[PDB]
């Protein structure tokens, strides 16, 4: 099952939080109505290149509702040290700095 990328803006509903596994859980609210759609999610150390680091734990993160302001959670496996959590694509993408150690 596949979906096209979500096109609208995301917002963090709360501070990203370390899980007991050392991973990071993130909850986002989605302003769009094109759901169901694929949530763009990655981590990077360099926002200019967006070269991926770490990986997404959540297999196929999706917004499942077609109504605005629905929420979803995703889990990320951040790299050693400092990185950025990057949700969404384009100019309206959101970022949050993360430190793992």
């Amino acid at each position, epitope marked *: 099952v596949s979906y096209s990328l979500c096109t609208a803006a995301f917002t963090f509903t709360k501070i990203p939080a370390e899980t007991l596994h050392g991973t990071v859980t993130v909850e986002v609210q989605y302003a769009g109505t094109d759901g169901p759609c694929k949530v*763009p*999610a990655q981590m990077a150390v*360099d926002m*200019q*290149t*967006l*070269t*991926p680091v770490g990986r997404l734990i959540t297999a196929n993160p999706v917004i499942t509702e077609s109504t605005e302001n629905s929420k979803m959670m995703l889990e990320l496996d951040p790299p050693f040290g400092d990185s950025y959590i990057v949700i969404g*694509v384009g100019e309206k993408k959101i970022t949050h700095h993360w430190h793992r150690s």
Partner: single-chain antibody
Amino acid sequence: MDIVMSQSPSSLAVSVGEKITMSCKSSQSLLYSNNEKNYLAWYQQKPGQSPKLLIYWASARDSGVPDRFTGSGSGTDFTLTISSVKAEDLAVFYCQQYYSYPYTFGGGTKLEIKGQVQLQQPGAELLKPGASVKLSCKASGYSFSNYWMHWVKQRPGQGPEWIGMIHPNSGNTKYNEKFKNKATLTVDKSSSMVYMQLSSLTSEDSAVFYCARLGNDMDYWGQGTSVTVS
């Protein structure tokens, strides 16, 4: 496992006005499923100049790049098309993957014709085997602190090699394993200066060393410092 970039043909001799195609193949897919982008760039290096970004995200043209340059392809197979060659296009064209660290470049296609951001680097050094040298990179025209500064090594007419990068604000670094004991990156935040110290110099180190802000719509290269080891 490092990604290997392969280009063909090694050289292309064409007359002005011809349409040409050149190929770039990666050993691993550069299509990142999370955001559906191809992390592939095309660089043009004219005589006497630093490499200049032409295409990023496999098909996005950088500002000022004419429509007659077209990047295409996806995954592991990419193509740069020049619809109508001009004499000024004479250059070596390099593809580069930025899907994974370390960044890697192809061996280049040499195009032969028959028919405010500043990164300032000093002039040539010449040194003896066993010595060390501290190369400098003076940055201006942008907010220095938050942009990664990369260092690149290029032997004559050969594929560039990504040495590593340093973030000035945090001092964080990422090194290519092949240079982890050869190069040391530091910054002087008070002077917007980036340094790369090369140790235990040998003739294998003789090359032009570039500092560069790499990637997408903010790609900028210094003029390079030529280092020759006796």
